[PDB]
């Protein structure tokens, strides 16, 4: 069962465990790079790094996918855009009015899958 | 609404967006360092870095807290441990039989709070 729990007091300023995303891409996403840590192969070309500012989160994302992740694009609450990166195969799915919390997945020579954890508004 | 959606196919090796954790600790947790990104103050002492392997996740976690986070320890599904680090103040809460997805929180000079996102089995 997916949940969250807060521990501790009311002070300080909020932070997120997710800080940056880049991809390698060609016809597919060869790799996703999350907070600098590479997952996937060495093919394609490396994208610039998107670093989240304070309080900035993915609010909308379009992923093309089939057996792999073909393409990713996203927009943040601050109206900044990443991508599209990758190719034109697969089929498209969109998340809208969300707050992405975490990205897990699976990868070999390419990025096979993404598990997006998010809050749906 | 906290939610998960998977995109793509069945192949490759699993990875988590949450890759590494270290802390600065003394009496309290002065800071948590998530995938190399520092959150909190410069006091206490820097712990070694714990880095997750493919398919590895925090399965049990004990947090002592009060006004701040006093202490953290955890165990993984591969029987590895981190901590305990910090002091004996505050009171303990344990998450048992979980899969940690994300660690967010709030920090100033110390780690005021943690907001742990997880699957509860
Ligand atoms: O993205 C998969 C594949 O696409 C193209 O064939 C090239 O850009 C490769 O280098 C890359 O590995
Ligand atoms: O995801 C890679 C590839 O997987 C399958 O072969 C199909 O869904 C394609 O359209 C897609 O491009
Ligand atoms: O990443 C694409 C492909 O790469 C490798 O061949 C393996 O890791 C497969 O399981 C995976 O599907
Ligand atoms: O239920 C998900 C989400 O839906 C809307 O955005 C609002 O009603 C929020 O209160 C709520 O949390
Ligand atoms: O952890 C809070 C605080 O605890 C002790 O007083 C010392 O270890 C300090 O350096 C540290 O900042
Ligand atoms: O959390 C830091 C500190 O906050 C309060 O002072 C109490 O709950 C203490 O027991 C605890 O050590
Ligand atoms: O982190 C402990 C403390 O540090 C600073 O004084 C501020 O950021 C406070 O809000 C916070 O509670």
XYZ file of N, CA and C and ligand atoms in Angstrom:
810
model
N 0.843 -1.193 0.000
C 0.000 0.000 0.000
C 0.884 1.250 0.000
N 0.728 2.110 -1.011
C 1.551 3.327 -1.112
C 1.072 4.402 -0.117
N 1.999 4.902 0.689
C 1.673 5.906 1.684
C 2.909 6.756 1.979
N 2.727 7.750 2.849
C 3.892 8.437 3.359
C 3.636 8.815 4.816
N 4.713 8.998 5.555
C 4.668 9.416 6.956
C 5.735 10.470 7.211
N 5.343 11.504 7.930
C 6.262 12.563 8.334
C 6.699 12.314 9.788
N 7.992 12.512 10.054
C 8.535 12.433 11.419
C 9.288 13.715 11.725
N 9.272 14.133 12.982
C 10.066 15.286 13.398
C 9.216 16.515 13.639
N 9.870 17.669 13.670
C 9.254 18.936 14.129
C 8.844 19.820 12.956
N 8.478 21.071 13.239
C 7.892 21.938 12.185
C 8.830 22.932 11.515
N 10.096 22.946 11.920
C 11.084 23.894 11.413
C 11.754 23.578 10.079
N 12.708 24.415 9.699
C 13.486 24.241 8.466
C 12.695 24.507 7.195
N 13.339 24.296 6.050
C 12.689 24.564 4.776
C 12.627 23.243 4.010
N 11.513 23.018 3.300
C 11.356 21.713 2.617
C 12.409 21.383 1.563
N 12.657 20.092 1.378
C 13.484 19.621 0.274
C 12.894 18.326 -0.268
N 13.280 18.023 -1.520
C 12.913 16.758 -2.189
C 14.175 15.945 -2.423
N 14.021 14.630 -2.305
C 15.051 13.665 -2.567
C 15.439 13.542 -4.045
N 14.566 14.012 -4.927
C 14.823 13.998 -6.374
C 15.382 15.364 -6.797
N 16.536 15.409 -7.451
C 17.152 16.724 -7.718
C 17.437 17.067 -9.189
N 17.680 16.035 -10.013
C 18.022 16.329 -11.411
C 17.763 15.098 -12.290
N 17.553 15.365 -13.577
C 17.306 14.327 -14.588
C 18.044 14.732 -15.874
N 18.691 13.740 -16.516
C 19.223 13.886 -17.883
C 18.901 12.527 -18.516
N 19.014 12.465 -19.826
C 18.824 11.198 -20.503
C 19.921 11.070 -21.542
N 20.248 9.829 -21.914
C 20.874 9.590 -23.236
C 19.768 9.138 -24.182
N 19.772 9.641 -25.421
C 18.688 9.273 -26.337
C 19.125 9.259 -27.783
N 18.405 8.444 -28.553
C 18.583 8.402 -30.019
C 17.166 8.098 -30.497
N 16.953 6.915 -31.058
C 15.597 6.444 -31.388
C 14.839 6.026 -30.137
N 15.592 5.652 -29.085
C 14.994 5.342 -27.771
C 15.648 6.229 -26.721
N 15.174 6.108 -25.486
C 15.967 6.503 -24.320
C 16.973 5.379 -24.012
N 18.255 5.635 -24.304
C 19.345 4.686 -23.966
C 19.599 4.635 -22.438
N 19.322 5.758 -21.790
C 19.630 5.846 -20.330
C 18.884 6.987 -19.697
N 18.573 6.823 -18.410
C 18.142 7.981 -17.626
C 19.189 8.182 -16.547
N 19.429 9.429 -16.257
C 20.457 9.818 -15.274
C 19.720 10.629 -14.191
N 19.658 10.073 -12.990
C 18.801 10.657 -11.912
C 19.742 11.065 -10.782
N 19.729 12.360 -10.500
C 20.641 12.989 -9.504
C 22.089 12.621 -9.831
N 22.405 12.606 -11.138
C 23.740 12.239 -11.668
C 24.057 10.757 -11.877
N 23.231 9.864 -11.331
C 23.507 8.412 -11.367
C 22.909 7.824 -12.652
N 23.767 7.217 -13.461
C 23.409 6.708 -14.776
C 22.709 5.337 -14.698
N 21.614 5.184 -15.427
C 20.977 3.889 -15.593
C 20.664 3.627 -17.057
N 21.282 2.589 -17.627
C 21.096 2.233 -19.049
C 22.430 2.106 -19.780
N 22.385 2.231 -21.107
C 23.524 1.957 -21.972
C 24.271 3.224 -22.321
N 25.204 3.081 -23.257
C 26.077 4.208 -23.646
C 25.751 4.803 -25.000
N 24.723 4.259 -25.662
C 24.294 4.758 -26.967
C 23.586 6.109 -26.922
N 23.171 6.573 -28.103
C 22.516 7.858 -28.208
C 23.443 8.995 -27.813
N 22.827 10.134 -27.507
C 23.542 11.355 -27.124
C 23.053 11.833 -25.779
N 23.960 12.396 -24.995
C 23.591 12.842 -23.641
C 22.921 14.212 -23.654
N 21.740 14.289 -23.060
C 21.011 15.556 -22.953
C 21.628 16.477 -21.909
N 21.302 17.785 -21.963
C 21.712 18.613 -20.814
C 20.999 18.137 -19.534
N 21.491 18.573 -18.376
C 20.854 18.153 -17.108
C 19.781 19.168 -16.729
N 18.602 18.646 -16.378
C 17.518 19.481 -15.801
C 17.625 19.369 -14.271
N 17.920 20.471 -13.635
C 18.010 20.527 -12.177
C 16.794 21.235 -11.610
N 16.074 20.536 -10.711
C 14.886 21.176 -10.054
C 15.290 22.283 -9.110
N 14.626 23.445 -9.270
C 14.806 24.531 -8.303
C 14.022 24.216 -7.014
N 14.160 25.104 -6.047
C 13.359 25.005 -4.827
C 11.855 24.955 -5.124
N 11.184 23.934 -4.584
C 9.755 23.820 -4.752
C 9.292 23.488 -6.169
N 10.216 23.037 -7.015
C 9.902 22.787 -8.427
C 9.752 21.295 -8.622
N 8.683 20.872 -9.310
C 8.410 19.444 -9.466
C 7.766 19.247 -10.834
N 7.861 18.024 -11.344
C 7.183 17.688 -12.618
C 5.665 17.712 -12.372
N 4.951 18.548 -13.145
C 3.470 18.640 -13.080
C 2.758 17.923 -14.246
N 3.506 17.646 -15.320
C 2.915 17.059 -16.521
C 4.018 16.349 -17.314
N 3.740 15.131 -17.773
C 4.760 14.359 -18.471
C 4.151 13.523 -19.570
N 4.885 13.431 -20.685
C 4.423 12.616 -21.828
C 5.552 11.602 -22.081
N 5.190 10.342 -22.045
C 6.150 9.262 -22.262
C 5.653 8.459 -23.449
N 6.485 8.296 -24.481
C 6.178 7.282 -25.543
C 6.884 5.976 -25.156
N 6.200 4.826 -25.204
C 6.818 3.588 -24.772
C 6.228 2.367 -25.512
N 6.990 1.287 -25.500
C 6.541 -0.014 -26.046
C 7.229 -1.073 -25.191
N 8.139 -1.837 -25.797
C 9.017 -2.697 -25.011
C 10.065 -1.870 -24.237
N 10.334 -0.627 -24.658
C 11.328 0.245 -23.983
C 10.669 1.576 -23.737
N 11.430 2.521 -23.204
C 10.969 3.925 -23.220
C 11.526 4.543 -24.499
N 10.600 4.924 -25.376
C 10.966 5.574 -26.662
C 11.274 7.071 -26.511
N 10.520 7.755 -25.646
C 10.635 9.241 -25.607
C 10.148 9.712 -24.259
N 10.764 10.775 -23.741
C 10.215 11.439 -22.572
C 10.165 12.972 -22.805
N 9.091 13.599 -22.291
C 9.053 15.066 -22.123
C 8.303 15.379 -20.836
N 8.675 16.486 -20.204
C 8.001 16.932 -19.015
C 8.012 18.462 -18.882
N 7.050 18.958 -18.110
C 6.920 20.367 -17.754
C 6.760 20.421 -16.212
N 7.384 21.419 -15.634
C 7.310 21.600 -14.175
C 6.230 22.618 -13.810
N 5.897 22.675 -12.520
C 5.024 23.749 -11.994
C 5.490 25.150 -12.327
N 6.790 25.308 -12.571
C 7.340 26.626 -12.885
C 7.336 26.903 -14.390
N 6.703 26.014 -15.132
C 6.534 26.134 -16.558
C 7.788 25.841 -17.360
N 8.789 25.232 -16.726
C 9.968 24.798 -17.486
C 9.786 23.424 -18.152
N 10.412 23.258 -19.307
C 10.171 22.038 -20.109
C 11.462 21.259 -20.336
N 11.356 19.935 -20.270
C 12.475 19.055 -20.561
C 12.065 18.198 -21.747
N 12.888 18.152 -22.800
C 12.513 17.297 -23.918
C 11.499 17.982 -24.830
N 10.867 17.213 -25.746
C 11.032 15.756 -25.911
C 12.438 15.290 -26.252
N 12.817 14.142 -25.693
C 14.050 13.440 -26.080
C 13.709 11.998 -26.428
N 14.368 11.497 -27.470
C 14.140 10.141 -27.953
C 13.465 10.120 -29.321
N 12.840 8.992 -29.628
C 12.327 8.742 -30.968
C 10.832 8.816 -31.025
N 10.294 8.348 -32.144
C 8.876 8.524 -32.451
C 8.061 7.214 -32.388
N 8.698 6.117 -31.991
C 8.015 4.831 -31.913
C 7.133 4.762 -30.674
N 6.536 3.603 -30.490
C 5.777 3.317 -29.273
C 4.401 3.941 -29.320
N 3.857 4.209 -28.137
C 2.590 4.851 -28.066
C 2.712 5.823 -26.892
N 1.916 6.894 -26.938
C 2.085 7.986 -25.993
C 1.098 7.854 -24.853
N 1.564 8.224 -23.653
C 0.722 8.334 -22.458
C 1.116 9.596 -21.729
N 0.141 10.268 -21.120
C 0.405 11.563 -20.481
C -0.051 11.554 -19.026
N 0.729 12.177 -18.143
C 0.261 12.487 -16.787
C 0.047 14.001 -16.749
N -1.083 14.428 -16.189
C -1.442 15.862 -16.110
C -1.854 16.234 -14.694
N -1.532 17.463 -14.272
C -1.919 17.936 -12.906
C -1.437 16.956 -11.836
N -0.163 16.587 -11.963
C 0.469 15.681 -11.002
C 1.582 16.409 -10.230
N 2.105 15.725 -9.242
C 3.369 16.121 -8.629
C 4.243 14.869 -8.571
N 5.245 14.781 -9.446
C 6.095 13.573 -9.420
C 6.982 13.574 -8.178
N 6.949 12.435 -7.476
C 7.680 12.277 -6.228
C 8.989 11.517 -6.433
N 8.957 10.494 -7.286
C 10.127 9.643 -7.483
C 10.032 8.935 -8.838
N 11.198 8.588 -9.392
C 11.255 7.783 -10.619
C 12.140 6.582 -10.320
N 11.552 5.392 -10.415
C 12.300 4.134 -10.431
C 12.202 3.549 -11.846
N 12.815 2.411 -12.072
C 12.698 1.789 -13.407
C 13.566 0.587 -13.529
N 13.763 0.182 -14.788
C 14.640 -0.939 -15.126
C 15.373 -0.599 -16.415
N 16.648 -0.998 -16.500
C 17.477 -0.680 -17.663
C 18.558 -1.718 -17.932
N 18.889 -1.878 -19.219
C 20.008 -2.718 -19.675
C 20.839 -1.870 -20.623
N 20.828 -2.224 -21.918
C 21.448 -1.403 -22.960
C 20.592 -0.169 -23.220
N 19.289 -0.279 -22.946
C 18.388 0.884 -23.053
C 17.605 1.068 -21.749
N 16.775 2.107 -21.687
C 15.845 2.268 -20.582
C 14.575 1.454 -20.909
N 14.388 0.327 -20.207
C 13.301 -0.593 -20.543
C 11.969 -0.090 -20.016
N 12.001 0.390 -18.778
C 10.769 0.840 -18.123
C 11.014 1.934 -17.086
N 9.937 2.681 -16.808
C 9.922 3.685 -15.734
C 8.747 3.390 -14.824
N 8.983 3.520 -13.504
C 7.913 3.458 -12.509
C 7.826 4.826 -11.907
N 6.765 5.542 -12.246
C 6.620 6.932 -11.827
C 5.721 6.890 -10.600
N 6.221 7.434 -9.493
C 5.414 7.616 -8.280
C 5.063 9.079 -8.202
N 3.780 9.346 -8.029
C 3.328 10.731 -8.100
C 2.022 10.910 -7.352
N 1.708 12.174 -7.062
C 0.421 12.577 -6.493
C -0.420 13.138 -7.612
N -1.646 12.646 -7.714
C -2.574 13.083 -8.769
C -3.505 14.117 -8.197
N -3.497 15.318 -8.778
C -4.375 16.385 -8.334
C -5.552 16.471 -9.314
N -3.619 12.380 -4.640
C -3.662 10.932 -4.489
C -2.339 10.298 -4.894
N -1.629 9.715 -3.927
C -0.369 9.007 -4.182
C -0.535 7.720 -4.993
N 0.228 7.634 -6.072
C -0.084 6.732 -7.150
C 1.229 6.266 -7.776
N 1.163 5.131 -8.461
C 2.325 4.585 -9.190
C 1.783 4.243 -10.579
N 2.584 4.507 -11.601
C 2.239 3.954 -12.929
C 3.547 3.514 -13.581
N 3.499 2.363 -14.253
C 4.675 1.814 -14.939
C 4.497 2.022 -16.444
N 5.574 2.368 -17.122
C 5.599 2.496 -18.567
C 6.742 1.668 -19.094
N 6.581 1.136 -20.322
C 7.612 0.322 -20.943
C 7.489 -1.183 -20.743
N 8.565 -1.900 -21.048
C 8.517 -3.353 -21.088
C 9.074 -4.073 -19.875
N 9.410 -5.351 -20.091
C 9.701 -6.261 -18.992
C 11.217 -6.445 -18.721
N 12.074 -5.886 -19.585
C 13.496 -6.202 -19.533
C 14.354 -5.351 -18.606
N 15.671 -5.570 -18.705
C 16.704 -4.841 -17.940
C 16.794 -5.177 -16.459
N 17.646 -4.443 -15.753
C 17.807 -4.616 -14.308
C 17.130 -3.452 -13.578
N 16.431 -3.739 -12.434
C 15.795 -2.664 -11.639
C 16.811 -1.648 -11.076
N 16.367 -0.405 -11.017
C 17.094 0.616 -10.286
C 16.067 1.498 -9.579
N 16.570 2.236 -8.587
C 15.742 3.198 -7.793
C 16.275 4.589 -8.003
N 15.381 5.598 -8.057
C 15.785 6.996 -8.062
C 16.609 7.333 -6.810
N 16.260 6.722 -5.682
C 17.027 6.890 -4.442
C 18.229 5.955 -4.527
N 19.421 6.545 -4.726
C 20.648 5.779 -4.968
C 21.586 5.688 -3.769
N 21.741 6.806 -3.054
C 22.663 6.816 -1.905
C 22.169 7.699 -0.761
N 22.608 7.349 0.436
C 22.268 8.134 1.639
C 23.484 8.219 2.541
N 23.751 9.431 3.053
C 24.693 9.594 4.170
C 24.077 10.610 5.063
N 24.650 10.716 6.261
C 24.152 11.705 7.208
C 25.335 12.413 7.854
N 25.090 13.620 8.333
C 25.947 14.232 9.365
C 25.156 14.060 10.658
N 25.837 13.592 11.712
C 25.132 13.326 12.968
C 26.010 13.660 14.167
N 25.355 14.038 15.267
C 26.062 14.170 16.559
C 25.038 13.715 17.555
N 24.512 14.693 18.309
C 23.331 14.475 19.164
C 22.043 14.250 18.317
N 21.944 14.975 17.198
C 20.823 14.894 16.298
C 21.344 14.491 14.908
N 20.449 14.374 13.938
C 20.884 14.407 12.557
C 21.062 15.857 12.110
N 22.319 16.276 11.949
C 22.603 17.642 11.429
C 22.201 17.752 9.949
N 22.303 16.637 9.239
C 22.001 16.695 7.782
C 21.727 15.287 7.268
N 20.951 15.231 6.192
C 20.904 14.018 5.354
C 21.382 14.371 3.940
N 22.111 13.443 3.320
C 22.762 13.691 2.034
C 22.143 12.606 1.132
N 21.311 13.055 0.190
C 20.529 12.141 -0.661
C 21.048 12.240 -2.080
N 21.577 11.115 -2.588
C 22.264 11.107 -3.902
C 23.314 12.228 -4.023
N 24.095 12.438 -2.938
C 25.114 13.467 -2.892
C 24.644 14.893 -2.541
N 23.340 15.119 -2.475
C 22.822 16.488 -2.229
C 22.616 16.691 -0.730
N 23.289 17.721 -0.202
C 23.298 17.983 1.252
C 22.028 18.709 1.701
N 21.405 18.237 2.775
C 20.191 18.887 3.358
C 20.366 19.007 4.878
N 20.616 20.235 5.329
C 20.874 20.534 6.767
C 22.177 21.298 6.951
N 22.723 21.240 8.178
C 23.825 22.076 8.644
C 25.164 21.396 8.500
N 26.182 22.047 9.053
C 27.529 21.529 8.951
C 28.039 20.902 10.253
N 27.177 20.795 11.262
C 27.628 20.244 12.538
C 27.664 18.725 12.558
N 27.935 18.138 13.735
C 28.076 16.681 13.793
C 29.230 16.161 12.899
N 29.158 14.875 12.568
C 30.202 14.196 11.799
C 29.621 13.460 10.608
N 30.349 13.427 9.483
C 29.814 12.796 8.271
C 29.933 11.273 8.360
N 28.820 10.579 8.185
C 28.795 9.105 8.126
C 29.323 8.636 6.767
N 29.671 7.335 6.664
C 29.915 6.769 5.326
C 28.622 6.812 4.514
N 28.815 6.672 3.202
C 27.687 6.665 2.252
C 27.200 5.228 1.999
N 25.895 5.052 2.107
C 25.261 3.779 1.767
C 24.686 3.885 0.366
N 25.082 2.947 -0.517
C 24.652 3.004 -1.900
C 23.843 1.745 -2.255
N 22.628 1.939 -2.776
C 21.742 0.801 -3.064
C 22.209 0.076 -4.311
N 22.098 -1.268 -4.266
C 22.358 -2.133 -5.419
C 21.059 -2.287 -6.191
N 21.140 -2.876 -7.382
C 19.968 -3.177 -8.195
C 19.022 -4.076 -7.378
N 17.752 -3.665 -7.291
C 16.730 -4.458 -6.647
C 16.705 -4.286 -5.128
N 17.565 -3.412 -4.615
C 17.694 -3.189 -3.161
C 16.896 -1.993 -2.717
N 16.236 -2.163 -1.572
C 15.498 -1.073 -0.965
C 15.442 -1.213 0.565
N 15.154 -0.091 1.222
C 15.002 -0.053 2.660
C 13.707 -0.804 2.976
N 13.829 -1.846 3.811
C 12.702 -2.719 4.172
C 12.219 -2.456 5.603
N 13.057 -1.819 6.412
C 12.729 -1.527 7.839
C 13.544 -0.304 8.188
N 12.923 0.632 8.899
C 13.602 1.885 9.250
C 13.171 2.341 10.632
N 14.126 2.765 11.463
C 13.786 3.310 12.799
C 14.261 4.744 12.835
N 13.335 5.645 13.181
C 13.680 7.069 13.237
C 13.354 7.474 14.655
N 14.321 8.067 15.353
C 13.993 8.737 16.616
C 13.842 10.240 16.303
N 12.800 10.854 16.834
C 12.542 12.264 16.569
C 11.821 12.968 17.712
N 11.912 14.303 17.683
C 11.314 15.204 18.693
C 11.026 16.471 17.918
N 11.620 17.585 18.341
C 11.625 18.778 17.501
C 12.388 18.574 16.178
N 13.413 17.713 16.193
C 14.233 17.389 15.007
C 14.265 15.863 14.801
N 15.022 15.423 13.796
C 15.335 13.988 13.717
C 16.550 13.732 14.592
N 16.378 12.865 15.593
C 17.468 12.534 16.521
C 18.393 11.440 16.025
N 17.818 10.481 15.296
C 18.574 9.259 14.994
C 17.931 8.589 13.779
N 18.737 7.928 12.943
C 18.156 7.031 11.889
C 18.947 5.727 11.861
N 18.252 4.636 11.574
C 18.888 3.386 11.212
C 17.950 2.731 10.209
N 18.527 1.912 9.336
C 17.649 1.091 8.481
C 18.278 -0.239 8.091
N 17.434 -1.108 7.537
C 17.834 -2.435 7.064
C 17.287 -2.536 5.649
N 17.994 -3.269 4.798
C 17.508 -3.433 3.430
C 16.976 -4.850 3.220
N 16.298 -5.047 2.075
C 15.793 -6.346 1.740
C 16.912 -7.369 1.460
N 18.149 -6.900 1.305
C 19.331 -7.778 1.106
C 20.122 -7.971 2.389
N 19.553 -7.506 3.474
C 20.098 -7.791 4.811
C 21.280 -6.899 5.189
N 21.418 -5.780 4.477
C 22.434 -4.756 4.769
C 21.873 -3.728 5.758
N 22.743 -2.999 6.454
C 22.260 -1.998 7.433
C 22.941 -0.652 7.263
N 22.273 0.398 7.740
C 22.869 1.723 7.839
C 22.533 2.224 9.236
N 23.528 2.767 9.903
C 23.306 3.314 11.240
C 23.289 2.191 12.265
N 22.832 2.502 13.493
C 22.252 3.809 13.827
C 23.271 4.952 13.819
N 22.784 6.144 13.479
C 23.530 7.408 13.603
C 22.628 8.428 14.316
N 23.242 9.132 15.272
C 22.583 10.243 15.970
C 22.610 9.963 17.459
N 21.726 10.612 18.203
C 21.664 10.432 19.659
C 20.440 9.679 20.111
N 20.224 9.666 21.439
C 19.208 8.798 22.061
C 17.964 9.572 22.458
N 17.899 10.838 22.061
C 16.756 11.682 22.408
C 15.486 11.409 21.587
N 14.460 12.215 21.826
C 13.200 12.061 21.081
C 12.555 10.702 21.383
N 11.673 10.249 20.497
C 11.081 8.911 20.658
C 11.152 8.185 19.341
N 11.168 6.852 19.442
C 11.408 5.990 18.271
C 10.097 5.662 17.573
N 10.128 5.666 16.245
C 9.083 5.039 15.441
C 9.777 4.119 14.454
N 9.209 2.933 14.226
C 9.765 1.980 13.242
C 8.782 1.665 12.104
N 9.241 1.822 10.867
C 8.528 1.323 9.707
C 9.040 -0.119 9.481
N 8.128 -1.087 9.399
C 8.482 -2.522 9.302
C 7.843 -3.088 8.065
N 8.576 -3.948 7.367
C 8.036 -4.636 6.175
C 7.500 -3.639 5.126
N 8.408 -2.756 4.687
C 8.104 -1.702 3.711
C 9.048 -1.769 2.517
N 8.818 -0.876 1.554
C 9.744 -0.657 0.467
C 9.835 0.874 0.393
N 10.934 1.470 0.851
C 11.066 2.947 0.769
C 11.224 3.372 -0.691
N 10.413 4.344 -1.076
C 10.428 4.888 -2.459
C 11.207 6.225 -2.507
N 10.911 7.130 -1.565
C 11.532 8.457 -1.607
C 11.717 8.957 -0.176
N 12.725 9.778 -0.019
C 12.955 10.479 1.265
C 12.999 11.984 1.004
N 11.947 12.693 1.408
C 11.892 14.162 1.363
C 11.968 14.599 2.831
N 11.912 15.891 3.086
C 11.931 16.356 4.500
C 12.054 17.849 4.543
N 12.510 18.371 5.689
C 12.734 19.806 5.875
C 14.005 19.955 6.696
N 14.832 20.965 6.391
C 16.134 21.147 7.067
C 16.476 22.611 7.200
N 17.244 22.921 8.248
C 17.809 24.273 8.486
C 19.244 24.013 8.879
N 19.565 24.335 10.125
C 20.830 23.922 10.734
C 20.850 22.422 11.036
N 19.688 21.837 11.280
C 19.587 20.395 11.505
C 18.571 19.797 10.540
N 18.421 18.479 10.590
C 17.337 17.840 9.849
C 16.089 17.911 10.734
N 15.238 18.897 10.457
C 13.984 19.065 11.249
C 13.001 17.902 11.116
N 12.859 17.408 9.893
C 11.836 16.397 9.642
C 12.147 15.604 8.360
N 11.578 14.400 8.323
C 11.647 13.526 7.177
C 10.225 13.174 6.765
N 10.006 13.149 5.451
C 8.745 12.732 4.895
C 9.080 11.533 4.025
N 8.766 10.351 4.554
C 9.197 9.077 3.931
C 8.030 8.580 3.097
N 8.272 8.367 1.820
C 7.279 7.772 0.902
C 7.617 6.304 0.683
N 6.639 5.411 0.879
C 6.905 3.983 0.857
C 5.667 3.140 0.586
N 5.922 1.903 0.195
C 4.903 0.879 0.131
C 4.911 0.106 1.445
N 3.726 -0.043 2.034
C 3.586 -0.796 3.293
C 3.048 -2.192 2.945
N 3.830 -3.226 3.210
C 3.307 -4.594 2.972
C 2.659 -5.166 4.232
O 18.352 5.213 -28.875
C 18.694 3.920 -29.390
C 19.705 4.100 -30.561
O 19.183 5.054 -31.477
C 19.976 5.265 -32.650
O 20.084 4.047 -33.413
C 21.356 5.808 -32.199
O 21.190 7.152 -31.715
C 22.039 4.887 -31.157
O 23.315 5.377 -30.691
C 21.070 4.610 -29.995
O 21.613 3.631 -29.108
O 9.540 0.682 -27.088
C 10.288 0.216 -28.197
C 9.394 -0.465 -29.247
O 8.718 -1.539 -28.616
C 7.823 -2.270 -29.506
O 8.537 -2.936 -30.569
C 6.783 -1.313 -30.132
O 5.870 -0.911 -29.095
C 7.454 -0.103 -30.817
O 6.553 0.834 -31.364
C 8.431 0.600 -29.836
O 9.109 1.653 -30.514
O 17.860 -2.542 -22.160
C 17.493 -3.264 -23.314
C 17.928 -4.723 -23.066
O 19.311 -4.659 -22.770
C 19.994 -5.872 -22.390
O 20.077 -6.640 -23.573
C 19.262 -6.642 -21.281
O 19.514 -5.952 -20.051
C 17.739 -6.765 -21.560
O 17.055 -7.331 -20.453
C 17.139 -5.390 -21.917
O 15.780 -5.512 -22.304
O -7.751 13.697 -4.375
C -6.651 14.186 -5.102
C -6.716 15.709 -5.116
O -7.806 16.140 -5.939
C -7.918 17.588 -6.066
O -6.752 18.277 -6.506
C -8.234 18.214 -4.712
O -9.532 17.835 -4.312
C -7.221 17.781 -3.654
O -7.821 17.920 -2.369
C -6.936 16.279 -3.710
O -5.962 15.918 -2.747
O 23.798 16.829 16.122
C 23.575 18.077 16.784
C 24.864 18.557 17.484
O 25.224 17.548 18.413
C 26.372 17.717 19.236
O 26.172 18.849 20.062
C 27.602 17.938 18.341
O 27.925 16.663 17.765
C 27.315 19.073 17.330
O 28.409 19.135 16.466
C 26.029 18.789 16.495
O 25.766 19.839 15.583
O 14.393 16.151 18.471
C 15.335 16.896 19.258
C 14.829 16.986 20.711
O 13.563 17.656 20.655
C 12.943 17.834 21.951
O 13.816 18.693 22.692
C 12.758 16.488 22.664
O 11.798 15.672 21.999
C 14.096 15.748 22.818
O 13.944 14.487 23.390
C 14.789 15.624 21.420
O 16.126 15.169 21.581
O 17.211 23.038 11.405
C 16.972 23.604 12.694
C 16.552 25.090 12.525
O 17.528 25.815 11.783
C 17.269 27.185 11.505
O 17.272 27.909 12.744
C 15.897 27.349 10.848
O 15.920 26.806 9.527
C 14.791 26.679 11.699
O 13.518 26.773 11.113
C 15.137 25.198 11.914
O 14.189 24.613 12.761
